[PDB]
Amino acid sequence: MDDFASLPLVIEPADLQARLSAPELILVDLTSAARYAEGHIPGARFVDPKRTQLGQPPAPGLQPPREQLESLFGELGHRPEAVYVVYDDEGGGWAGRFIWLLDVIGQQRYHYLNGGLTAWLAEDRPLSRELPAPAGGPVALSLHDEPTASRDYLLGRLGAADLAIWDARSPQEYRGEKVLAAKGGHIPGAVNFEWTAAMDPSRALRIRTDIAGRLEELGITPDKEIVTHCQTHHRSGLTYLIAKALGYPRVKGYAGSWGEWGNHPDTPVEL
Ligand SMILES: [Mg+2]
Ligand SMILES: [Mg+2]
Ligand SMILES: [Mg+2]
């Protein structure tokens, strides 16, 4: 992991600024076309958040098709020595989802910029309006199912002693007060910790430093397999990332999420 190998998964703006010219760095911005054009971290390559999603029924939060991933990753310059640093401007949902995609393509070396652009801007760090050159054509990817829980896999695990389901939606969605599918409620046995509750707004949307204790209060502990989800596996990108960042050995993103679970005929719902 060359220049980044000594760092933990979640790095600070200072760590990234010192390493902006590292040749192995693939810096990925998942803010927005407007934010990226207004000014991005120097050398950052834009990945519109919509491109991280299949975006088609019945489960739009699934990973994009092979063709789209192969093109995307060739555009970013995916290569053997690459080290990805990922950020967004919303506290890490899209960044964390992109890191789940990095696990899907088997990429081992990557970091999350704590607080993303929010923290970068809060510290008045340099911005660029320049475009890096896309590396090239599509790369042939090896796609992995390990990082992702399927609907059927999750159905078979429900109620297991060794499972925690981290529902990253708002509490109103978790309790079925705010219903965005045929069925309202949550997956049986799941616990709720909204993605934004994991951020610290007083520290530019970095991950709260007391996160471990808060996850432990909900029984989300590293000795359990953690399956996390929201409506489309956007918000649960952050929560997936946090579990990985804390060193939890068994973490899956339930990509279908509530857009699938709340609408599928087979899935039990609990209020
Ligand atoms: Mg946004
Ligand atoms: Mg092929
Ligand atoms: Mg709220």
Curated annotation (Swiss-Prot):
Any one GO CC term of the record: cytoplasm
Residue positions of the active site: 230
Domain Rhodanese, chain residue ranges per copy: 21-129, 159-270
Localization (cell): Cytoplasm
InterPro entries (alphabetical): Rhodanese-like_dom, Rhodanese-like_dom_sf, Thiosulfate_sulfurtransferase, Thiosulphate_STrfase_CS
Chain residues that bind substrate: 235
Broadest EC class assigned to this enzyme: transferase
Source taxon at top rank: Bacteria
Molecular functions (GO terms): thiosulfate-cyanide sulfurtransferase activity
One Pfam family of this chain: Rhodanese
CDD domains: TST_Repeat_1, TST_Repeat_2
SMART domains reported in the protein's UniProt record: RHOD
Catalytic activity field: thiosulfate + hydrogen cyanide = thiocyanate + sulfite + 2 H(+)
Entry EC no(s): 2.8.1.1
Organism of origin: Azotobacter vinelandii
Free-text comment on this protein's domains from its UniProt entry: Contains two rhodanese domains with different primary structures but with near identical secondary structure conformations suggesting a common evolutionary origin. Only the C-terminal rhodanese domain contains the catalytic cysteine residue.
Keyword Cytoplasm listed: yes
Keywords: Cytoplasm, Repeat, Transferase
PANTHER family linked to this entry: THIOSULFATE SULFURTRANSFERASE
Designated name of the protein: Thiosulfate sulfurtransferase
